[PDB]
Amino acid sequence: VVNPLFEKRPKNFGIGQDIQPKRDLTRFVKWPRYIRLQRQRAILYKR
RNA sequence: GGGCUCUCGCUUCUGGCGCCAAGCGCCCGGCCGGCCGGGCGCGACCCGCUCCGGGGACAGUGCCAGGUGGGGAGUUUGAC
């Protein structure tokens, strides 16, 4: 029944091994000046 | 099988290649147990409040006060 051709082909997201995937980067975004403002406004209000 | 600490998370003989996902699970869409065409998530751990670091309540900026200042400006440099 099974085809010998269907090999399972894992990828190595190691250092240098293979190129890395497009994962979520919201924490490091260069936000516009209005957003960065209102956020660190609320933070000052806390501090 | 259990507690504790640290490390790692897989690359050092060579002038090479390396993108646009494999696989699995779970869903169902048309046709007729089989065919054609679709979707999500694991695979690629979870949560957060400042992009990362270094300084830092001092440099610094604004206003007064003393000083220094032919680098520069203005003027003078007697009479018989």
Ligand SMILES: [Mg+2]
């Ligand atoms: Mg002067």
Ligand SMILES: [Mg+2]
């Ligand atoms: Mg004059």
